[PDB]
Design a protein around this ligand. Structure first.
Ligand SMILES: *[C@@H]1O[C@H](CO[C@@H]2O[C@@H](C)[C@@H](O)[C@@H](O)[C@@H]2O)[C@@H](O[C@@H]2O[C@H](CO)[C@@H](O[C@@H]3O[C@H](CO[C@H]4O[C@H](CO)[C@@H](O)[C@H](O)[C@@H]4O[C@@H]4O[C@H](CO)[C@@H](O[C@@H]5O[C@H](CO)[C@H](O)[C@H](O)[C@H]5O)[C@H](O)[C@H]4NC(C)=O)[C@@H](O)[C@H](O[C@H]4O[C@H](CO)[C@@H](O)[C@H](O)[C@@H]4O)[C@@H]3O)[C@H](O)[C@H]2NC(C)=O)[C@H](O)[C@H]1NC(C)=O
Lengths: 207, 413
């Protein structure tokens, strides 16, 4: 029996409209001893608000059991530590796992929007690029919009560790060339704890 | 100098129908549906469009006498005026030609373009238009001359038809040179785009040099106040524009403090109008309820409530409609003046531009004793909440918070 503790999603901690969760996942739970007890500690203080889910048999004939603890935005951002203790008969001893926000001096993202290469104007669709760099920790979210609507035809790279210990990523929004060439405005929207209000944006448009 | 409809209230520039009314709904028929809202602002005229056929930089595919069908039919326009007239809202048509281009006045075709205007003026005046706007006049050769021609054509049809000229010029002398030929012409400019004595100076110097003739007051020919002003000065500047002698001109969203730079994906000159929380794309953190019309309607402390109250005062009180204007000295960063017509209710405006709380330090002796100050005047409103509105304040003891403006009223006596 093995345990994996997962942090909340960046969007959940940064946007205060959403509900961040820490997730304790137990795998390799036997059919003989399927009962799992979860204990949760926030900075060593036990809490009782966690919601344990019904165990679910995997194709490898083992059970996966999940406990979900709702967290407070500010607790996560202020570096509180979440401990999941898993007890099971097949275990010599309970398994204890601890997770928190990465430690280290937060660093503000720099956001640079980059127009398509001229060489891409050959094509029917062009690539609008958003470079986000210089941020720590790696938790970040990126969204695109135009004047009136969300723009959903985008993909964002995972954060990559840069030379200086900060992180960067790129987001690529694909749009019809005509929309670009007609001077329509797009914006790359970034959420990170080290921004004012956890939010900034940069526009991108033809000259 | 007789009263005209544009003396009686604020003008309201709607330069982009779709931004104003919402996505897909940038039609003349959809503007009809917003006239009640506008009536709620007590605006006296909409400046509309342009709405004419313009293919970027195509002097030949530019017919100012034909509506671009994306906005709707000529019927919808006829039906809009009808509904607008019926609600006592006047309609000014922007005829700036190359509005899709970068030089609104095209290039190397100075006389060719002008002709389409001249013809458009007539055509649209016959259609029932209450006036016209033309922007970016500094990019029009023979500026002074072309405006005089269009003035005389507009005034020729009726003295109750207005022509607005807009410029990016903030230089006084250049503005006077355009106004030298046509003095009954409303000129929107960047003249007022700081110091309390300097805004005082600008205003007094302008009125000084124009013999206290009728003028517009604005921050620009098209842009929102938020282009020039930090949030903390918006309320003050609205109090001033609504109480200075002349026509205050705003752009849609000024009444809610709409700031294009704070909203992702928004062109400076045409952000989406925030009716409610469903108006803007779902970008979390971008629009709170208190940034929308719906939200600010519910709040007596809101900029929209303030706008509504000032527009009401400005459009019903003789001293504000056509009163004299007497500025006087105050604390360093204070601009203070009175408006007074005949024996109607007087208004005292005290504006604290600086970011430090100040004693008003009003001196009543530099004012003419035709309307010198009583000991106490009823506070009509403050830009900031928590004062005692409808009760007297002792004028010699006035302390204004940072960025605070006060509107006091007192009768003839
Ligand atoms: C029997 O089967 C189980 C189940 O496995 C699946 O089914 C079997 C039959 C096969 O098909 C498998 O391929 C299937 O996965 C086996 O269980 C697996 O054990 C692995 C260890 O041996 C374990 O690996 C560790 O994974 C970690 C990451 O897990 C992520 O990502 C994987 C995909 O990469 C995904 O499968 C996991 O479910 C998990 O996904 C995350 O889940 C969390 C919690 O739900 C999500 O976070 C929450 O999300 C919700 C919204 O959904 C909400 O937002 C909450 O706020 C938020 O917290 C999160 O979003 C998910 N991420 C993604 C990407 O989707 C690694 O970190 C870890 O690495 C470490 O250890 C490695 C060595 O093991 C090292 O190499 C490494 O360096 C690290 O140190 C592990 O790789 C698998 O996760 C686990 N699979 C599942 C499904 O739980 C079992 O092993 C097998 N028994 C046998 C045959 O032995």
């Amino acid at each position: 029996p093995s345990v994996f503790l997962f942090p909340p999603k960046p969007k959940d901690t940064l946007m205060i409209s959403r509900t961040p969760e820490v997730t304790c996942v137990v795998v390799d739970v036997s059919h003989e001893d399927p009962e799992v007890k979860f204990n949760w500690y926030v900075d060593g203080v036990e809490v009782h608000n966690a919601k344990t889910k019904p165990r679910e048999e995997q194709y490898n004939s083992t059970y996966r059991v999940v406990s979900v603890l709702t967290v407070l935005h500010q607790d996560w951002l202020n570096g509180k530590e979440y401990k999941c203790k898993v007890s099971n008969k097949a275990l010599p001893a309970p398994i204890e796992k601890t997770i928190s926000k990465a430690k280290g001096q937060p660093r503000e993202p720099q956001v640079y929007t980059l127009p398509p290469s001229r060489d891409e104007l050959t094509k029917n669709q062009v690539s609008l690029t958003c470079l986000v760099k210089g941020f720590y920790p790696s938790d970040i979210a990126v969204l695109w919009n135009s004047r009136f609507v969300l723009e959903n035809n985008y993909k964002t790279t995972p954060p990559v560790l840069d030379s200086d210990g900060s992180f960067f990523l790129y987001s690529k929004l694909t749009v019809d060339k005509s929309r670009w060439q007609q001077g329509n405005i797009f914006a790359c929207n970034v959420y990170h704890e080290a921004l004012h209000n956890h939010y900034t944006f940069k526009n991108l448009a033809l000259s | 100098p007789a009263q005209k409809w544009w003396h009686t209230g604020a003008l309201y520039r709607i330069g982009d129908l779709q931004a104003f009314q919402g996505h897909g709904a940038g039609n003349l028929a959809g503007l009809k549906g917003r006239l009640d809202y506008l009536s709620s602002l007590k605006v006296k005229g909409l400046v509309l469009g342009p709405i004419h056929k313009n293919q970027k930089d195509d002097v030949a595919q530019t017919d100012l006498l034909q509506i671009d069908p994306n906005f709707g039919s000529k019927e919808d326009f006829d039906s809009l005026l009808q509904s607008a007239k019926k609600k006592s809202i006047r309609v000014i048509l922007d005829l700036t030609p190359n509005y899709r281009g970068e030089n609104s006045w095209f290039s190397t075709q100075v006389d060719t373009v002008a002709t389409k205007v001249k013809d458009a003026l007539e055509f649209w005046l016959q259609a029932g238009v209450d006036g016209f706007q033309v922007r970016d006049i500094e990019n029009l050769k023979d500026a002074s001359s072309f405006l005089a021609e269009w003035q005389n054509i507009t005034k020729g049809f009726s003295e109750d038809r207005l022509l607005i000229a807009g410029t990016n010029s903030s230089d006084l002398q250049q503005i006077l040179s355009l106004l030298e030929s046509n003095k009954d012409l409303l000129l929107t400019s960047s003249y007022l785009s700081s110091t309390g004595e300097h805004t005082k100076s600008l205003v007094t110097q302008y009125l000084n040099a124009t013999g206290n003739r009728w003028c517009s007051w604005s921050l620009s020919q098209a842009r929102l106040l938020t282009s020039f002003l930090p949030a903390q000065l918006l309320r003050l500047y609205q109090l001033m524009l609504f109480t200075l002698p002349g026509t205050p001109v705003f752009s849609y969203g000024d009444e809610i403090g709409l700031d294009a730079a704070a909203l992702p994906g928004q062109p400076m000159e045409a952000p989406v109008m925030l009716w409610d929380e469903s108006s803007f794309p779902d970008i979390p953190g971008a629009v709170s309820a208190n940034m929308t019309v719906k939200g600010q309607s519910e709040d007596p402390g809101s900029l929209l409530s303030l706008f509504r109250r000032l527009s009401d005062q400005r459009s019903k009180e003789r001293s504000l409609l056509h009163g004299d204007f007497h500025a006087f000295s105050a604390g360093p960063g204070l601009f203070s003046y009175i408006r007074h017509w005949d024996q109607n209710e007087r208004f005292l405006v005290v504006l604290n531009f600086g970011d430090v709380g100040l004693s008003a330090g009003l001196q009543a002796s530099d004012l003419p004793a035709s309307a010198s100050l009583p000991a106490k005047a009823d506070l009509l409103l403050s830009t900031q909440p928590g004062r005692e509105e409808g009760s007297p304040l002792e004028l010699e003891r006035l302390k204004l918070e940072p960025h605070e403006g006060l509107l006091l009223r007192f009768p003839y006596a």
